[PDB]
């Protein structure tokens, strides 16, 4: 058919969108134990029975967890069984034959979902599909229990029956590239911004201050963030898999943790630095030298490395559950599986402690500003808005993740992986947000204008 363009009209992709790939046994909207791609194991409330049926179907001891290959095999087996079920039935086949490829895919979808007999139960709907009355069949199918139990999927399939096209499912492909370009813009913004900052601090001599040393550290963390973590992550997300190996997977993960930790902790160091610089400027200028600041930076990077590369490369961060073992064994898998200890410890070190210290410090600033040797001016309002942005951005970017990161481990996930990755990236854009917050000094402005000759 000379069709090698993305998204070909078929039953497989339709069902992948409707069901969704999951390797571990889960419960559907009804409550039955499902696995893979909409593969019903048993109607038995016992999970052990589901494991028995699963092991019987696959052909080995799966422990409730299967691989991608087995999932696809089960998928094709169930689709083929659905088709054969349609051809074997006396109510489905006369309808199935008098249907175009798309509507055929819709019928195969229904049979795939609720079995042969159940779909054969739709006397009126099939009687209308056979007479090519798509709208009446749509309205009628919109009055079933199937539409009441799974309204969204029912709406999509019914729409597919009505229009006869793939308009109900074609709206996803556009979303894929639609977020792809966003990822591109993210990488570009981060890299450009941080390279600009680092170059500005490095080249000019008027920007050689301790605060700007901390800014240099932060900008380096965000730079390695935008050059390594973000692009490889984008490639991992878009291509649905991982094509670099387990070693580079755990290495990329190490860079992830290291960069995030270093970034946040450096933000904390900046907060404290500015507190001492504003509250007690003379002691700040006398005590904190460039060497002391360098030692501080070294300490931050060491602590960051101790919570990233060390546990990860020593497999200490690794989990014990079956899916984690499979993913660690799988070369194409690079999902983020950890145990309670590592998740909690890393969350505390990387995010929570710097969060607490920063909140306390800025609160100390706002508090001590009101007890100086002094008319409700507007400068204090502007400063309050400034710190509101400084802390507000950081919070809004990294708080949703580390909370979820601590919730996703305390109990087996009711939190979708989509949300996990999404919030992780909401944390990722903070690296690009930082140069627009910590580099608004007049010297930084002039430097930025001179660097690109605007």
């Amino acid at each position, epitope marked *: 058919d000379a069709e090698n363009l993305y998204f070909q009209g078929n039953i497989f992709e339709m069902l992948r969108i409707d069901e969704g790939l999951r390797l571990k046994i889960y419960k559907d909207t009804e409550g039955y134990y499902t696995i893979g791609i909409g593969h019903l194991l048993t109607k038995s409330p016992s999970l052990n029975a589901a494991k028995s049926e699963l092991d019987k179907a696959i052909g080995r001891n799966t422990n409730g967890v299967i691989t991608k290959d087995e999932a696809e095999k089960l998928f094709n087996q169930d689709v083929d069984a659905a088709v054969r079920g349609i051809l074997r039935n006396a109510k489905l086949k006369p309808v199935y034959d008098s249907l175009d490829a798309v509507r055929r895919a819709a019928l195969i979808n229904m049979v795939f979902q609720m079995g042969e007999t159940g779909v054969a139960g739709f006397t009126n709907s099939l009687r209308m599909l056979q007479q090519k009355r798509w709208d009446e069949a749509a309205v009628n199918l919109a009055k079933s229990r199937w539409y009441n139990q799974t309204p969204n999927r029912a709406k999509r399939v019914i729409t597919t029956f009505r229009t006869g096209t793939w308009d109900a499912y074609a709206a996803d492909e556009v979303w894929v590239v639609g977020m792809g370009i966003v990822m591109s813009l993210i990488v570009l913004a981060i890299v450009f911004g941080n390279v600009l900052v680092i170059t500005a601090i490095a080249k000019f001599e008027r920007l050689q201050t301790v*605060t700007n040393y901390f800014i240099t550290s932060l900008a380096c963390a965000d730079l390695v963030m935008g050059l390594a973590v973000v692009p490889f992550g984008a490639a991992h997300i878009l291509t649905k898999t991982w094509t670099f190996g387990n070693f580079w997977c755990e290495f990329w993960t190490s860079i992830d943790v290291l960069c995030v930790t270093a970034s946040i902790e450096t933000l904390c160091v900046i907060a404290v630095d500015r507190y001492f610089a*504003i509250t007690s400027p*003379f002691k700040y200028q006398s005590l904190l030298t460039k060497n002391k600041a360098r030692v501080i930076i070294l300490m931050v990077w060491i602590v960051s490395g101790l919570t990233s590369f060390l546990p990860i490369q020593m497999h200490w961060y690794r989990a014990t559950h079956q899916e984690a073992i499979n993913c660690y064994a799988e070369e194409t898998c690079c999902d983020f599986f950890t145990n309670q200890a590592y998740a909690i410890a890393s969350s505390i070190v990387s995010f929570y402690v710097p969060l607490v210290i920063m909140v306390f410090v800025y609160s100390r600033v706002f508090q001590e500003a*009101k007890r100086q040797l002094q008319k409700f001016a507007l400068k204090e309002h502007k400063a309050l808005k400034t*710190l509101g942005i400084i802390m507000g951005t950081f919070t809004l970017c990294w708080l949703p993740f580390f909370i979820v990161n601590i919730v996703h481990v305390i109990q087996d996930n009711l939190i979708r992986k989509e949300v996990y990755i999404l919030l992780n990236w909401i944390g990722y854009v903070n690296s690009g947000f930082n140069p627009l917050i910590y580099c*608004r*000094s*007049p010297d930084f402005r002039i430097a930025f204008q001179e660097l690109l000759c605007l």
Partner: nanobody
Amino acid sequence: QVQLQESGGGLVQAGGSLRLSCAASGSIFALNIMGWYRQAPGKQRELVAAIHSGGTTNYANSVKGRFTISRDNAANTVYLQMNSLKPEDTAVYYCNVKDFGAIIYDYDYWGQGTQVTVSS
């Protein structure tokens, strides 16, 4: 968009006393460093004496023990007491305000500058 009114400078005999003064007209952030800098004939701009909004002060190594900086209570006015003046103190004195309203960095406000001449 605030202003700095400097006053007090002038000619003075060697060993005589002089009183500088800077008045900050406008809205300045509560946390600031109000001080005095100077430019000697053929020398770079040097810090004379700065005072923080928290009362604490800071003097140069050539004025410590001779110069004493203080500030007003509510009008944000800084007075610089210059006792036992020397011919090397003959310079151009600028009033200065380090504002911390940006928290991350500091906004600088400068005065028009006053001339001080010590008769050698």
